[PDB]
């Protein structure tokens, strides 16, 4: 028996969303990662209802979404992760109602493991060099720059992976035109799992760790 | 004859190969059906390292690819596929 | 750091194997969607609640000698 | 006779390994400047780490026939 | 082929003649121009005039 | 003495040549501190305080001369010892080590890394040494190679980040007394590099307060120099600091001294180029003077104003752009004829930038820009200026797309036909560029005739080796398209005159141009020039020059692709035996062309041969299937497919099988690849049943060769193995039995190369049948025989799913044998990195012990 699949109705779960001027103009746009499918919605004020423009079956797992419009940019480049380390920075193109992978970079293997990045995506709105990190001591720093034609040139990954330190959440704070500070709720699970007694559960709580990925140092330093 | 590799953070640098070592993959070492292009780390294209073969370690004549039997196995998602070991290190003849 | 983290070797203890088992089985829970929208229906909690619970359980689950 | 010496009649198809093997016959080599300009091609300059080794190489290289031609050595001021 | 080859040769000769004529015309044009330019005669030292 | 001082001692037009690429032996070049391992330099017995740091320099030699880990250990140790080594002696020993000319590329990188580590360790201690690195890193930042300048900038940034901004300010400020222009430029670049890393606004106020005075022209020039250097080093990071820098740079736009005005114009142009294309808000702060002083300054002032306007125009808006262009044309179009090169190149760049801008439409360019550009620029007056010949050609190619190709195709048919070959080369280059940019739409009848006449005159009057005409002839022929048929005899006579000339380079260029324009002319449905082309093609078959032979072979291949049998002039029964010995040549390009020629010979009709001749050709080409050049390896496989399809399955299969025993294992495997070519050239049952009978022979290295051939067969057959995989399962199972030590790697390789090829196509049954036998072979102590099974397991994990592989490998994950877990844990690791989260829903339910919580109860819900 040979079976063939058909999606008689796409998913209806808004597991993620990100707001931004994605079409380029001042028109707001909200992207919803509904799991396998990614959709874009425009909140039409003339009618009140939100119109979902595109429902692209992504064939992956969008662990996180974090849009970013560059310094002096009309549209915004959505950063997406999947089951594999293939990080996709794509920008919407209203020419024919279709997306476009502006840059598909390879980070790690497939499978959302603890050491394979692709879980959390922390953008720096007051700067560049977005962090793309996993749950267990895996975090790369993609430096974004503008070419002569304002191209979104992705730099080399400046890995600042910790040692047996779990990551709760990661967000990039807007610095005052200085090196972008990136805070994360990190917890050292290595120093606790190496004692016979049992008191390691206490006295070891989460901690805010902020790294500065200055271009001068060319690496994310705490 | 167990060759070692760099296996560092795969940057945004494309791969290369020599006039004789251009067909086979940097890891699979096969000439059958190249699937994807290989890459390198930041310490693989730096000054003298500009445009060097990933297998022959000399002049580059093409782009380093992976074998279809090595890209389907997720082998390309590892670190820098540069063929470097204790013998094939930076201070080599 | 990332040499072979995720699995032991020839004389890996059963506890140290189950610890990695749970520590890499929750990442498929905090990241995957069907196995995260399914646990929030059984426990009857929100996504953030169950995710924070699973994250806090990654300290030393499976029964820690701490 | 100074430390740096200029050599003429240099070929256009030569690598650094052959120049290093030619320079290592008399002693060590400290610096070598090859011309990539079309107005400065065919000539180069070489300086050694020792003054006595450079003075010996300037005498040993004067008149060395190679590739059915002759080389011209000059002492820079 | 004893007639086709001859025809080809003739064609080639004609082409050559045409080329020559074109060259002559070009030369004539150049001569005419040399009658008066042209941006300002020898506009090279005018913009320079020292420095 | 240093490398930068030595490079200053060399004149311009030269490049520094690097050296070619239980510690190792010593070297006489490291005799500065090579007395530790060579002499009795006892720093701990009798020596000054902390003299062992000098031996650390010898340890630095261990970082240079030694092993990679032994070299990195020195840096890892010095990282935790720089604070207890003394800043003074440490700097005095580290700076001269890299200052010497013997600092190689890798040596320079190692020294830069060491200095960066020392600065990161000695942060405040680097302040007193600021006068040292500033005198050392300054020349290295102004080196010729980009790597040297990058290393110098990195060292300067590290030294700046080591101390505070006040130290860098107090160091670079009094260094402005260097009256030498080179020293002043070096100090300006050093300050710019220090500001690019220590914060642009962190040093902006100090620089603006120290440079806004009126001491002399030195400081006023150095301010703009540092501004331009910072804008060039930062790049796209001048967006926020654009107006902040323009506020201090606007003091030179109306400066009294012409030098300060030129420096301000250069800085403004650099800032506009760095912050381009968008963001011209700050540019409006000096946009009015930039648009006014175009026809106001004199000489250098007007030149700098035009250079700045050329960069400010494309970044400007659409409304004010036309006004700025009209205001600049008063001094641009009037002074189009440049007395020197600095004005001509600047005017060409400004014209190119204006043409790139969307403000001035094509109408304004054709009205006020086309006639002046054609009169003062479009001429043969630059037949020898290489830079001018490139700049004018680029500007014309950029402006042709906007002003229409027909507007220039009917106006540049004279520079190429001119007798001056020097300007004719540039004219042909520009014509080819315009034809490649626009295409063939804007081509008038008279314009097309004039272009054809000019191209013919240039090709005929090719007194020198001008490849521009050779590259443009093919482009013109492609632009002709269907119009090349009416223009057939002109190009035909041209090619005949260029081919019968009997000149080596002339014949090579003619063959190249014929091969480029072969499909356009021969495929015009003529059936008249085929004989005239084939008679001359096969004539010069024994050309001694290999390049001419390759060109002739390519032309013959193009003719055979455009012509048919027996439409081609050379007979097939004659060209085949004539081309047969040509394939035996050792020439790279000649053999590469001959392979494709032999392949295309059997393309359309393909019979045109005796079977023995085709068999001999295949036997000869079988040795070239593994050549060094990949092009020959691809052409051999591309030709052997058609050769085997034309000859026959059974004959080629029998020939390949008989060839397995001969040609001992130095080039034997390629023959096996040829068998795979049959599988790639014919159906799977063309080599399967014939090769199956080759296993009935009881020979050891006969079945071994059969397995080695089936390996490459299933590795190159692709997705065709799913159609026939159950009939080849027993053949691999019988070979996978306990037969020998070499008949095991072959079966495992066949299985691994067939699983990846039948990935997810619905043939897991036979995969399980083969895995049942492939698993017990895991217990093998042969170091060269484990990899053949390890690769098979790594392929089966990714083509079967861990739900069954881990199911097999679970029973022994804690086996009592110390040498049994060594393989089970290795296989588990190999199956873990692949399908990391895919095997999570594959493990058993580890029951809960009384000492912990082992059961994963968080997955046993019912919802």
Curated annotation (Swiss-Prot), chain A:
Localization in the cell: Nucleus
Segments of this protein annotated with the region Interaction with PHF5A, SF3B1 and SF3B5: 105-119, 145-168
Region listing for Interaction with SF3B1 and SF3B5, in residue ranges: 193-222
Annotated positions of the Phosphoserine modification: 156
Subunit structure: Component of the 17S U2 SnRNP complex, a ribonucleoprotein complex that contains small nuclear RNA (snRNA) U2 and a number of specific proteins. Part of the SF3B subcomplex of the 17S U2 SnRNP complex. SF3B associates with the splicing subcomplex SF3A and a 12S RNA unit to form the U2 small nuclear ribonucleoproteins complex (U2 snRNP). Within the SF3B subcomplex, interacts directly with SF3B1 (via HEAT domain), SF3B5 and PHF5A. Identified in the spliceosome A complex; remains associated with the spliceosome throughout the splicing process. Component of the spliceosome B complex.
Family: Belongs to the RSE1 family.
Protein name per its UniProtKB record: Splicing factor 3B subunit 3
Organism this protein belongs to: Homo sapiens
Part of the whole protein covered: 1 to 222 of 1217
UniProtKB/Swiss-Prot annotation, chain B:
Protein name (database record): PHD finger-like domain-containing protein 5A
Residues of the full protein shown: 6 to 98 of 110
Swiss-Prot/TrEMBL keywords: Acetylation, Activator, DNA-binding, Metal-binding, mRNA processing, mRNA splicing, Nucleus, Phosphoprotein, RNA-binding, Spliceosome, Transcription, Transcription regulation, Zinc
Region (Interaction with SF3B1 and SF3B3): 30-46
Binding site residues for Zn(2+) 2: 18, 21, 53, 56
Region described as Interaction with SF3B3: spans on this chain: 74-77
Protein origin, superkingdom: Eukaryota
UniProt organism field: Homo sapiens (Human)
Biological function: Component of the 17S U2 SnRNP complex of the spliceosome, a large ribonucleoprotein complex that removes introns from transcribed pre-mRNAs. The 17S U2 SnRNP complex (1) directly participates in early spliceosome assembly and (2) mediates recognition of the intron branch site during pre-mRNA splicing by promoting the selection of the pre-mRNA branch-site adenosine, the nucleophile for the first step of splicing.
Entry GO terms, CC: nuclear matrix; nuclear speck; nucleoplasm; nucleus; precatalytic spliceosome; spliceosomal complex; U12-type spliceosomal complex; U2 snRNP
Residues annotated for Zn(2+) 1 binding in this entry: 6, 41, 44, 80
Any GO MF annotation of the entry: DNA binding
Annotated site (Interaction with SF3B3): 12
Compartment(s) where it occurs, according to its Swiss-Prot or TrEMBL record: Nucleus; Nucleus speckle
Residues modified to Phosphoserine: 89
Swiss-Prot record, chain C:
High-level lineage: Eukaryota, Metazoa, Chordata, Craniata, Vertebrata
Full protein segment contained here: 15 to 80 of 86
Subcellular location: Nucleus
Marked site (Interaction with RNA) residue numbers: 6
Entry superkingdom: Eukaryota
Main subcellular location of this protein, as a coarse class: nucleus
Subunit structure: Component of the 17S U2 SnRNP complex, a ribonucleoprotein complex that contains small nuclear RNA (snRNA) U2 and a number of specific proteins. Part of the SF3B subcomplex of the 17S U2 SnRNP complex. SF3B associates with the splicing subcomplex SF3A and a 12S RNA unit to form the U2 small nuclear ribonucleoproteins complex (U2 snRNP). Within the SF3B subcomplex, interacts directly with SF3B1 (via HEAT domain) and SF3B3. Component of the minor spliceosome, which splices U12-type introns.
Presence of keyword Acetylation: yes
Family: Belongs to the SF3B5 family.
Single Gene Ontology BP annotation: regulation of DNA repair
Region: Interaction with SF3B1 and SF3B3, residue numbers: 1-62
Gene Ontology cellular component terms for the protein in this record: nucleoplasm; nucleus; precatalytic spliceosome; SAGA complex; spliceosomal complex; U12-type spliceosomal complex; U2 snRNP; U2-type precatalytic spliceosome
GO molecular function: RNA binding; splicing factor binding
Function summary: Component of the 17S U2 SnRNP complex of the spliceosome, a large ribonucleoprotein complex that removes introns from transcribed pre-mRNAs. The 17S U2 SnRNP complex (1) directly participates in early spliceosome assembly and (2) mediates recognition of the intron branch site during pre-mRNA splicing by promoting the selection of the pre-mRNA branch-site adenosine, the nucleophile for the first step of splicing.
PTM annotation (N6-acetyllysine): residues: 3
Curated annotation (Swiss-Prot), chain F:
Domain of life: Eukaryota
Keyword Lipoprotein recorded: no
Cross-link (Glycyl lysine isopeptide (Lys-Gly) (interchain with G-Cter in SUMO1)): 15
Cross-link (Glycyl lysine isopeptide (Lys-Gly) (interchain with G-Cter in SUMO2)): 15
Site (Interaction with RNA): 28, 146, 594, 608, 700
Keywords tagged on the record: Acetylation, Citrullination, Isopeptide bond, mRNA processing, mRNA splicing, Nucleus, Phosphoprotein, Repeat, RNA-binding, Spliceosome, Ubl conjugation
Region (Interaction with PHF5A): 106-109, 715-716
Renumbered ranges of HEAT repeats: 88-127, 128-162, 163-200, 202-236, 239-277, 322-360, 402-440, 569-607, 611-649, 681-719, 722-760
Positions bearing the site annotation: Interaction with SF3B3: 161, 236, 764
Region (Interaction with SF3B3 and SF3B5): 807-863
Modified residues (Phosphoserine): 2, 47
Site residues (Interaction with PHF5A), renumbered to this chain: 151
Subcellular locations according to the entry: Nucleus; Nucleus speckle
Segments for region (Interaction with SF3B14): 88-127
Main location: nucleus
Example of a GO MF term: RNA binding
Post-translational modification: Phosphorylated. Phosphorylation occurs concomitantly with the splicing catalytic steps.
GO cellular component: a single term: U2-type precatalytic spliceosome
Annotated GO biological process: chromatin remodeling; mRNA splicing, via spliceosome; positive regulation of transcription by RNA polymerase I; positive regulation of transcription by RNA polymerase II; positive regulation of transcription by RNA polymerase III; RNA splicing; RNA splicing, via transesterification reactions; spliceosomal complex assembly
Family classification: Belongs to the SF3B1 family.
Protein name: Splicing factor 3B subunit 1
Organism: Homo sapiens
Source species taxonomy: Eukaryota, Metazoa, Chordata, Craniata, Vertebrata
Originating gene: SF3B1
Residue window of the full protein shown: 399 to 1304 of 1304
